[PDB]
Amino acid sequence: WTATSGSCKGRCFELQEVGPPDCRCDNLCKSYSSCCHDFDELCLKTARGWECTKDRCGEVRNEENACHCSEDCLSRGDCCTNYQVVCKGESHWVDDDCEEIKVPECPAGFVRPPLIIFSVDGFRASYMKKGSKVMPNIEKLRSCGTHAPYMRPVYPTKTFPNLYTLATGLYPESHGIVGNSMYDPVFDASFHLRGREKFNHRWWGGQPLWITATKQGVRAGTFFWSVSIPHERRILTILQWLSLPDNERPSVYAFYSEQPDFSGHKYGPFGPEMTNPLREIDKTVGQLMDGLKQLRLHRCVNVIFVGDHGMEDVTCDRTEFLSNYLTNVDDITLVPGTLGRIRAKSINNSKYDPKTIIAALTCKKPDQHFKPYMKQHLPKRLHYANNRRIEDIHLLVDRRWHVARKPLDVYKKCFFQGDHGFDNKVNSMQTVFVGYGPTFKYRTKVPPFENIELYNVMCDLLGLKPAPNNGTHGSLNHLLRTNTFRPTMPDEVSRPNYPGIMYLQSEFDLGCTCDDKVENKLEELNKRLHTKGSTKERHLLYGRPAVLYRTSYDILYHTDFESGYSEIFLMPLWTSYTISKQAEVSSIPEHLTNCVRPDVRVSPGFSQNCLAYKNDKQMSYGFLFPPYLSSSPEAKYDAFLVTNMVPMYPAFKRVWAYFQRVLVKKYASERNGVNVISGPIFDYNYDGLRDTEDEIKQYVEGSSIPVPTHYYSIITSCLDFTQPADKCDGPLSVSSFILPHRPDNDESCNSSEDESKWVEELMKMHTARVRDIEHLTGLDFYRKTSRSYSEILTLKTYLHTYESE
Ligand SMILES: *[C@@H]1O[C@H](CO)[C@@H](O[C@@H]2O[C@H](CO)[C@@H](O[C@@H]3O[C@H](CO[C@H]4O[C@H](CO)[C@@H](O)[C@H](O[C@H]5O[C@H](CO)[C@@H](O)[C@H](O)[C@@H]5O[C@H]5O[C@H](CO)[C@@H](O)[C@H](O)[C@@H]5O)[C@@H]4O)[C@@H](O)[C@H](O[C@H]4O[C@H](CO)[C@@H](O)[C@H](O)[C@@H]4O[C@H]4O[C@H](CO)[C@@H](O)[C@H](O)[C@@H]4O)[C@@H]3O)[C@H](O)[C@H]2NC(C)=O)[C@H](O)[C@H]1NC(C)=O
Ligand SMILES: NS(=O)(=O)c1ccc(C(=O)N2C[C@H]3CN(C(=O)c4cnc(OC5CCOCC5)c(C5CC5)c4)C[C@@H]3C2)nc1
Ligand SMILES: [Ca+2]
Ligand SMILES: [Cl-]
Ligand code: NA
Ligand code: NA
Ligand SMILES: [Zn+2]
């Protein structure tokens, strides 16, 4: 109930929202049917349009007009944005040659440059190039400021998840807005686009920028506009706020555009109808810039032009129907469209089984256009599992397609020609970033980066300390002229032991056997120095990783590789080796097929044993440093040490073997040598963070050997590939992966073919950032290079996407 009987005189677009049932005059009041009776009349004036004309110049102030061309307008701060151009001989901002803004040029009384965030829904990254002829203001911002060729959204590439990620620096799984549509089982409530429940505060986790600003004494402009308030009025309101007295004037502002997303749904991303919305957005940017110029704020304000997701071609006829796969279709609820989320229609139904549902949806038709997953098996790069609002069963849908429950859903609701929501690595989902102003660089292109990084940067632009978030603070220092954030390396928590030869062969009772026999003073000092760390500079290129938690581990040196061996997990945490362009692949000799050798530096009690793998009918084992890449027949024995051994399902050995035998040598040829760091990951509670011992759900039968949920590899070389990995003078180049450790290859529909038909495709799907790996293992890589830390942070957030240009 609102007593909508008060008045909005002298209150239009008030900065604080008043408590019901007193009526409101803020920019959100319409969305709450709570505006005072006179709001439209006083606050939404439209008389005479949005632009001065020759004859309106000098006019007597008529307070009914939408904007003014009278003499006093400037001091009042309510001119039409084109006033000085029409009435005073001035040029449009877009017609001026750009000039570097070396320092803020701001009116007296401004304590910091203000920030304006200009958000555009569905602005696909390729519109910057393809629509450049019709967006002159946006192109001037792009080419004079700092820009990226595209910005990566979060999954799912929907509007609410992405806008709230921009505001908080958080993955959807952490901020809580995990879709445009949600069911929260703890609240027993639903969140929908239409309706009231989305206004409830309990949905919205983390700490968004406007709250971070307020708590630290920076005034924020009311960010959100009711949909019916036209774009022109939003611009004018912002310009008016910028004219307020210093003690009332906000330091940060938000403008949101429903376009081009709205049109893109109807017409497809490149429909000929798509030109006009793009023209209209550019005109709005022009109005803001002409407006700032009138107030002499155009070399004072930082402007961020940013999108939430792109847009792809999608029509009704490209729909897969769960009713063509499942007998029991009325027993399930589906969240449909460009992603699938399935749960039970009724929790009283004890005959609902996720396993049988997954099985009925797995590889059933030759060209099937979705793939079912348990959420914990989704690629780790999506970070889409650790939230009770995300259903256990998920369908990743092919780009260009939709999934629905029954044909009736589609034709009882072809309408649309564009949609979005797909995997965030898809090219058509990519969006835009441009930063322009005194704190940004001048005419600079930066490489693509993820939208989770911007919250940190907007805090920096405003002198705020960011709430804890998923950005890597400092990884975007290269966008900024000043205000950079200079972080320090995390301190190592555990130092390693360096064990020598301390045990005799006969003390091991592990049930392991090896055919090693036969043999000398030359090559005996030679093998001992290898075990003392003589080739370590060849294989440990960037320092050893630091262990950022309390644990007990050893450094182990060998001719071909170095490792950090965990006495708690009974296996390496990391194994590091270098494969040069010329290195040769050999094979495992026959006398060594089932060879496993005790490691005389590590006690029996801290070792794996072969008997457990024998007894475990499902589990087998593999090696972290691959025997195929040993540098000599004598070095090959090192690769069979029990301390190089890890648990592997036979199904996963098909993947691992192909990676080690074929792919490592391939990358070494293509990249001029590579450095590889490999190891296990344990994430049983699927939160994207390293498990402690008491979190491990599975061990090799009868033993304390814990089973990894994933295996990672970090493959590094020289960005200038004319130099070999081990003698690089400049920037590095990285790609990495987190492969799920699974007892079957159900994820790959073609896995009964040769590994050369499906393995590399699986790895690409599970591409990762070094930073994803750090979270999952508690390690910190690249501790000793010649590069600056900021540059290393950038490299650690890099993702190799394998999309085309
Ligand atoms: C991305 O960045 C984010 C932000 O940095 C990272 O997430 C953080 O991870 C921290 C470590 O897991 C976590 O710290 C915990 O805080 C608990 C208190 O949490 C409240 O306070 C914070 C801060 O104000 C607040 O933001 C939280 O809000 C969450 O919960 C509500 C839902 O009710 C949501 O509105 C909100 O969106 C958010 O949800 C998300 O987080 C929770 C986890 O907290 C998830 O479960 C959700 O799915 C969702 O993702 C909270 O209001 C604190 O209680 C924890 O302490 C426990 O564990 C420690 C270990 O040190 C132990 O010492 C304690 O005893 C305690 O255990 C007790 O509780 C157990 C569980 O009930 C119980 O079993 C035990 O026996 C004990 O009794 C913990 O310190 C921090 O909250 C989140 N922050 C956010 C915003 O998510 C994230 O890790 C990053 N991701 C990656 C990949 O790096
Ligand atoms: N495109 S789609 O997914 O089909 C789809 C679905 C619903 C809608 C829709 O009705 N709408 C109506 C729109 C009103 N709106 C907003 O006011 C808002 C504007 N800024 C925002 O973020 C910040 C602003 C500051 O800097 C960083 C980003 C947010 C955040 C969620 C809180 C919210 C966004 C709503 C989606 N639009 C598109
Ligand atoms: Ca975990
Ligand atoms: Cl959704
Ligand atoms: Na076995
Ligand atoms: Na398969
Ligand atoms: Zn949309």
DSSP-derived letter for residue 24 is: B
Q: Which residues contact 666 (CB under 8 A, 6 or more apart)?
A: none
Residue nearest to atom 9 of ligand 2 (CA): 193
Q: For residue 445, what are the CA distances in angstroms to 141, 148, 319, 479, 798?
A: 12, 6, 39, 9, 16
Integer Cα distance of 207 and 175 in angstroms: 8
Locate 457 and state its tokens.
């940067």
Pairing of strands 710-718, 674-681: antiparallel
Within 13 Å of residue 432, how many CA atoms lie on the same side as its CB?
27
Q: Which atom of ligand 2 is nearest to the CA of 225?
A: 17
Locate 804 and state its tokens.
């085309």
Integer Cα distance of 343 and 331 in angstroms: 9
| Residue 188 counted as an annotated binding residue | no
**Mapping DSSP to helix (H, G, I), strand (E, B) and coil, where does residue 804 land?**
coil
Q: Which residues surround ligand 6, an ion (CB under 5 A)?
A: 745, 748, 751
Residue nearest to atom 18 of ligand 2 (CA): 224
Locate 407 and state its tokens.
């044909």
Is the distance from CB of 781 to CB of 796 less than 8 angstroms? Answer: yes
Across the strands, what pairs with 563? 556, 575
Integer Cα distance of 278 and 123 in angstroms: 9
Taking the centre of ligand 4 as the mean of its atom positions, its distance from the CA of residue 192, in whole angstroms, is: 9
Q: Give the distance from CA 493 to its chain's centroid.
A: 28
Across the strands, what pairs with 781? none
Helix-then-strand count for the chain, H and E: 22, 28
Q: Which atom of ligand 2 is nearest to the CA of 224?
A: 17
Q: Could you tell me which of 346, 303, 306, 314 has the C-alpha nearest to residue 328?
A: 346
- Residues touching ligand 1 (Cβ under 6 Å) are 170-171, 173-176, 205-206, 383, 386-387, 468-470, 688-689, 775
Q: For residue 143, what are the CA distances in angstroms to 96, 446, 694?
A: 13, 12, 54
Taking the centre of ligand 4 as the mean of its atom positions, its distance from the CA of residue 180, in whole angstroms, is: 4
| Residue 685 counted as an annotated binding residue | yes
Is the distance from CB of 133 to CB of 419 less than 8 angstroms? Answer: no
- Residues touching ligand 2 (Cβ under 6 Å) are 117, 119, 121-122, 158-160, 163-164, 166-167, 180, 193, 223-225, 254, 256, 261
Taking the centre of ligand 5 as the mean of its atom positions, its distance from the CA of residue 620, in whole angstroms, is: 4
Taking the centre of ligand 6 as the mean of its atom positions, its distance from the CA of residue 619, in whole angstroms, is: 19
Q: Identify the active-site residue in 81, 146, 159, 319.
A: 159
| Residue 691 counted as an annotated binding residue | yes
| Residue 162 counted as an annotated binding residue | no
Q: Could you tell me which of 359, 396, 437, 363 has the C-alpha nearest to residue 144?
A: 437
| Residue 591 counted as an annotated binding residue | no
Q: For residue 352, what are the CA distances in angstroms to 215, 320, 343, 372?
A: 48, 22, 9, 17
Cα torsion 164, 384, 199, 39 to 10°: value is 30
Locate 668 and state its tokens.
């070494």
Q: For residue 756, what are the CA distances in angstroms to 464, 750, 753?
A: 51, 10, 8
Residue 133 CB coordination number (10 Å)? 9
Within 13 Å of residue 235, how many CA atoms lie on the same side as its CB?
24
Is the distance from CB of 716 to CB of 725 less than 8 angstroms? Answer: yes
DSSP 572-589: EEEEEEEE-TT-------
Show contacts of 98-101: CB within 8 Å, 24+ apart. 98/140, 98/143, 98/144, 100/442, 101/299, 101/437, 101/438, 101/442
Span between the terminal Cα atoms of the chain, in Å: 55
Residue nearest to atom 25 of ligand 2 (CA): 254
Mutate to test the pocket of ligand 2, among 31, 117, 159 (most ligand atoms within 8 A of CB): 159
Q: Which atom of ligand 2 is nearest to the CA of 159?
A: 3
Q: Which ligand is nearest to the CA of 694?
A: 3
Q: Which residues contact 191 (CB under 8 A, 6 or more apart)?
A: 177, 181, 182, 183, 184, 197, 198, 203
Interaxial angle between packed helices 454-461 and 159-168, expressed in degrees from 0 to 180 and rounded to the nearest 10: 40
Mutate to test the pocket of ligand 2, among 26, 115, 163, 227 (most ligand atoms within 8 A of CB): 163
Note the residue count of the chain. 805
Taking the centre of ligand 7 as the mean of its atom positions, its distance from the CA of residue 121, in whole angstroms, is: 7
Q: Which atom of ligand 2 is nearest to the CA of 210?
A: 25
Residue nearest to atom 22 of ligand 1 (CA): 206
Q: Please compute Rg for the chain using Cα positions.
A: 30
Active site residue 709: no
Taking the centre of ligand 1 as the mean of its atom positions, its distance from the CA of residue 475, in whole angstroms, is: 24
Q: Which atom of ligand 1 is nearest to the CA of 173?
A: 50
Taking the centre of ligand 4 as the mean of its atom positions, its distance from the CA of residue 727, in whole angstroms, is: 49
Q: For residue 248, what are the CA distances in angstroms to 217, 494, 541?
A: 12, 51, 55
Locate 777 and state its tokens.
């293992």
Architecture of domain 505-797 in this structure: 3-Layer(aba) Sandwich (3.40)
